[PDB]
Amino acid sequence: GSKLLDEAIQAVKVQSFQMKRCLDKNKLMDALKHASNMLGELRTSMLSPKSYYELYMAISDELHYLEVYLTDEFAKGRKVADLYELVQYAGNIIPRLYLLITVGVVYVKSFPQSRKDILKDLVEMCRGVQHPLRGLFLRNYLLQCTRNILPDEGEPTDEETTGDISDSMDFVLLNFAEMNKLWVRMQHQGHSRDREKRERERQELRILVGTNLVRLSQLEGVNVERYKQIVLTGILEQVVNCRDALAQEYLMECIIQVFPDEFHLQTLNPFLRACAELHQNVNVKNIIIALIDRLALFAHREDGPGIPADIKLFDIFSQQVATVIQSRQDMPSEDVVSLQVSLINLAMKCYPDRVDYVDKVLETTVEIFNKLNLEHIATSSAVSKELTRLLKIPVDTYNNILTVLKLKHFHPLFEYFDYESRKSMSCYVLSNVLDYNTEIVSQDQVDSIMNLVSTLIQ
């Protein structure tokens, strides 16, 4: 019907009108009685995640008018006594905790001495809502209300405040673990014939879980050593143990995106060891590719430190990509080759100098094709698509096309193509050597040009 949604938003607008009305008269307890009635609409199970999201947003906006009423009232010396206790009298838990979170943040601002205990209390008392949808949205509201008030390092030096960066890291990691738990739990609720609908619903709600990792990256006190020992250690513990492909794939990608490259460079072997532990239905190729792509943009960014000499990127990724591929049960051959492309791409952008790296990928690529007892690869096959894209990168990217001809293992890969693609690829290489004018060719490279013609004509 979709009326339920609109009926609720109508009811919300009625109660939120009478709330602000009472707030004008300074009738707080009567305002809260309507705030609770408004919040009562969040108890429903009849709305979809999209419908419920819309209802949440309406109610979140109205709660802000209450939260700002309290914060000013408290700032101007007219603080309401026992208000923390009073909102817990609510007989229904969902109104109770939304009101408790609202009053909690007002207390943190107004009474800095109570900051550590109230935050720890709010994250802990949310355990009351075990329902996935409603629990996720409650814990999300906790995370938004507390955005500006969590402990951090660049803070005003008021020595009556409580709680440090450690308490903030535990606050968000704890909320993260509970939200992920609820989010995964959605996989098993309802009837067994709505499996594709559930995975669709879960997909929509992924942003709620990922905001926790976003919040961890926003903490100025989260340095590289805290990331290594606490934050990534916390995050990876949930990721590998949740045993859920949808969350694993999302959360690993979300790490790459949210944290800086300074942190990624110190944590490569832990991150890639985790990639090998993920569920078989996870696109591990996409995780590894997105990481390499991010480090490539970090190599070419000047007015930054660049890539240290002790972090041997090529040796790390060559070795771990191999190990990850070994961990997969049935990885398509095209995907294995898509990874060779990113290993080339990495080596080109992070080490333009070192041609021997680019050739070692091609040498290993040969070993892969050689090892694989392959029937003839048609031009229409996806393996051919990638091997073509692989070989075109050195030819397209390099300044001087002479340097490509000096590669030892560039040409032995031509063997494995279709007849049609040997002709096409030999032509594409030879065409580019005329499109840009030739200097005199050395002994090694004279041999390579003849081999390219011999593949073109025959």
């Binding site: 001495q113 109230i118 738990k181 067994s192 949740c242």
Partner: protein
């Protein structure tokens, strides 16, 4: 102190428990009504399809065929030993078996649909009841392929 934040200390939840699938799965569908016989001795049967992870049930997946009388037999067997006040069935419709009606009687489609829903309603309330899960009559009705009325009630 401005706020009472007292809580009892809790034992952290083990991650196999937090992320493992729940141990309360039980869905029963009543589907696919079919006429069995010809003429006078016709009667409808329904497929009763069970999926579960409760260890008390012998099969994690089962499909069996059942008559409305089988539903009557189960309710009767439960009313005698279980001490579970048993929910009502959707109703024997004696007057629908009378001849020359303005519908197909006991094989009217709106009738079979409303009966079917009532039977699914009934079996889901009964199968989820803890005291009903002990009785041998329930497991017989849901997972043996044919009911044995000459049985000795146990458990």
């Amino acid at each position: 102190t401005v706020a009472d934040t007292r809580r009892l200390i809790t034992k952290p939840q083990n991650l196999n428990d937090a992320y493992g699938p729940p141990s309360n799965f039980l869905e029963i569908d009543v589907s696919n009504p079919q006429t069995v016989g010809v003429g006078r001795g016709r009667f409808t049967t329904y497929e009763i399809r069970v999926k579960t992870n409760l260890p008390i049930f012998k099969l994690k997946e089962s499909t069996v065929r059942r008559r409305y009388s089988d539903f009557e037999w189960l309710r009767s067997e439960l009313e005698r030993e279980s001490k579970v006040v048993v929910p009502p069935l959707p109703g024997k419709a004696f007057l629908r078996q009378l001849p020359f009606r303005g519908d197909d009687g006991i094989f009217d489609d709106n009738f079979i649909e409303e009966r079917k829903q009532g039977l699914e309603q009934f079996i889901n309330k009964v199968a989820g009841h803890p005291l009903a899960q002990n009785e041998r009559c329930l497991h017989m009705f849901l997972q043996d392929e044919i009911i044995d009325k000459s049985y000795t009630p146990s458990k």
